[PDB]
Design an enzyme around this catalytic site. Structure first.
Site, PDB file in Angstrom:
ATOM      1  N   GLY A  43      -4.660   6.021   2.059  1.00 39.04           N
ATOM      2  CA  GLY A  43      -5.368   6.867   3.353  1.00 39.04           C
ATOM      3  C   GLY A  43      -4.247   7.146   4.125  1.00 39.04           C
ATOM      4  O   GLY A  43      -4.166   6.571   5.024  1.00 39.04           O
ATOM      5  N   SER A 110      -4.978   5.074  -4.014  1.00 38.19           N
ATOM      6  CA  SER A 110      -5.466   6.399  -3.216  1.00 38.19           C
ATOM      7  C   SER A 110      -3.845   7.065  -2.639  1.00 38.19           C
ATOM      8  O   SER A 110      -2.963   7.103  -3.424  1.00 38.19           O
ATOM      9  CB  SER A 110      -6.348   6.020  -2.081  1.00 38.19           C
ATOM     10  OG  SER A 110      -7.092   7.253  -1.535  1.00 38.19           O
ATOM     11  N   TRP A 111      -3.852   6.962  -1.239  1.00 41.02           N
ATOM     12  CA  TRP A 111      -2.576   7.558  -0.734  1.00 41.02           C
ATOM     13  C   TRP A 111      -1.515   6.862  -1.082  1.00 41.02           C
ATOM     14  O   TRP A 111      -0.324   7.287  -1.424  1.00 41.02           O
ATOM     15  CB  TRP A 111      -2.738   7.730   0.790  1.00 41.02           C
ATOM     16  CG  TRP A 111      -1.198   7.966   1.293  1.00 41.02           C
ATOM     17  CD1 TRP A 111      -0.712   6.862   1.997  1.00 41.02           C
ATOM     18  CD2 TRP A 111      -0.339   9.065   1.213  1.00 41.02           C
ATOM     19  NE1 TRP A 111       0.590   7.421   2.491  1.00 41.02           N
ATOM     20  CE2 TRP A 111       0.913   8.550   2.081  1.00 41.02           C
ATOM     21  CE3 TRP A 111      -0.556  10.129   1.042  1.00 41.02           C
ATOM     22  CZ2 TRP A 111       1.873   9.205   2.171  1.00 41.02           C
ATOM     23  CZ3 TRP A 111       0.499  10.985   1.309  1.00 41.02           C
ATOM     24  CH2 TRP A 111       1.848  10.748   1.575  1.00 41.02           C
ATOM     25  N   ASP A 265     -15.699   8.316  -7.849  1.00 40.71           N
ATOM     26  CA  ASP A 265     -14.681   7.666  -6.810  1.00 40.71           C
ATOM     27  C   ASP A 265     -14.983   9.603  -6.237  1.00 40.71           C
ATOM     28  O   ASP A 265     -14.654  10.347  -6.668  1.00 40.71           O
ATOM     29  CB  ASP A 265     -13.593   7.820  -7.228  1.00 40.71           C
ATOM     30  CG  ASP A 265     -12.127   8.038  -6.100  1.00 40.71           C
ATOM     31  OD1 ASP A 265     -12.455   8.808  -5.142  1.00 40.71           O
ATOM     32  OD2 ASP A 265     -11.111   7.355  -6.503  1.00 40.71           O
ATOM     33  N   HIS A 293     -14.549   4.888  -4.921  1.00 41.41           N
ATOM     34  CA  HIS A 293     -13.117   5.087  -4.490  1.00 41.41           C
ATOM     35  C   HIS A 293     -12.468   3.691  -4.169  1.00 41.41           C
ATOM     36  O   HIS A 293     -11.302   3.500  -4.671  1.00 41.41           O
ATOM     37  CB  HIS A 293     -12.933   6.028  -3.571  1.00 41.41           C
ATOM     38  CG  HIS A 293     -11.563   6.316  -3.148  1.00 41.41           C
ATOM     39  ND1 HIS A 293     -10.389   6.932  -3.804  1.00 41.41           N
ATOM     40  CD2 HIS A 293     -10.830   5.786  -1.980  1.00 41.41           C
ATOM     41  CE1 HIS A 293      -9.243   6.852  -2.810  1.00 41.41           C
ATOM     42  NE2 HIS A 293      -9.689   6.081  -1.951  1.00 41.41           N
TER      43      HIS A 293
END
Length: 314
Positions: A43, A110-111, A265, A293
């Site tokens: 994130g 994720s990020w 997710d 997620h």
């Protein structure tokens, strides 16, 4: 294993001055002379957590955890000055040289899967294997799904709160309406928006609702998180090519990798995990059913603990 390793202390920590106004925080837990590994938090703007240490085997891994830039204990709090994808790629190398590792496992979801890819694809010799999760390649379709038209249809009541502060004209581009506010001279203004961007995510990042979604409201975190996230999205991750990350996989196809992704997710769709796998057949894709997620979803955690144990004790 199925769960996390027990809580433990970092054996070392400190701040690495980048030289352009940034001092980034970094920990060092696991084993001094173990298998070198790096944790890449996600994130854009989120930060590392003591729990990110329990994710690797204590006796076999030497994990480097680091706060990104303007987030966590990393000094320049909420600093979007010199804070892009490519600057961060530089910090991973400094930390590498500093740490004294010539190559290591890149663990990021994720990020962090984004940055893992972006880093692996520009320093293919410094990663031994990769363990990705909730793939995020930063294409326009993906920013539009979570921040414009898509995830909205699944949390209609949650998205109305995110929209409450925007004029109808402003509603046709949430990401931009939010960049105004987030970069307001007035900080009460920029905190009101920051709390609304953060909570939306913290609330749709898990299948079932959890109480710990509250942490995303916390002013400081919400100020850094929201403004760093919206910063990177506004610049489209700083990539010149919507698909630069997919269209660049050949450069790392030769690297052992495992891909974990939750069927449900809502932050980054399965379509991203599949697209990357469709392009990287040598990678083992694991679409965990019945999950969301978050890495800590029991099904995603399992495959992550399994990938880790395997990639070390091979």
């Amino acid at each position: 294993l199925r769960g996390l390793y027990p809580p433990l202390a970092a054996y070392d920590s400190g701040w690495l001055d980048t030289g352009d106004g940034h001092r980034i925080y970094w920990e060092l837990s696991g084993n001094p002379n173990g298998k070198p590994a790096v944790f890449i938090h996600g994130g854009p703007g989120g930060g590392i957590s003591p729990h990110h240490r329990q994710l690797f085997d204590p006796e076999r891994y030497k994990v480097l955890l680091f706060d990104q830039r303007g987030c966590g204990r990393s000094r320049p709090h909420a600093s979007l000055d010199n804070n892009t994808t490519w600057h961060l790629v530089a910090d991973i190398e400094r930390l590498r040289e500093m740490a004294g590792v010539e190559q290591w496992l890149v663990f990021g979801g994720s990020w962090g899967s984004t940055l893992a890819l972006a880093y692996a694809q520009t320093h293919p010799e410094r990663v031994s294997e990769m363990v990705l999760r909730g793939i995020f390649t930063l294409r326009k379709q993906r920013l539009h799904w979570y921040y414009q038209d898509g995830a909205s249809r699944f949390f209609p009541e949650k998205w109305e709160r995110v929209l409450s502060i925007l004029s109808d004209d402003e509603r046709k581009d949430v990401i931009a309406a939010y960049r105004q506010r987030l970069t307001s001279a007035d900080p009460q203004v920029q905190l009101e928006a920051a709390k609304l961007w953060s909570v939306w995510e913290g609330e749709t990042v898990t299948l079932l609702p959890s109480r710990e979604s509250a942490s995303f409201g916390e002013d400081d975190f919400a100020l850094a998180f929201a403004r760093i996230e919206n910063h990177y999205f506004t610049h489209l991750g700083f990539l010149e090519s919507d698909d630069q990350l997919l269209r660049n996989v050949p450069l790392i196809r030769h690297i052992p990798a495992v891909i974990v992704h939750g069927r449900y997710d809502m932050a980054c769709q399965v379509q991203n995990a599949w697209d990357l796998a469709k392009a990287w057949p040598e990678a083992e894709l694991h679409i965990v059913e019945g999950a969301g997620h978050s890495y800590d979803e029991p099904g995603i955690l399992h495959q992550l603990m399994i990938a880790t144990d395997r990639f070390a004790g091979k």
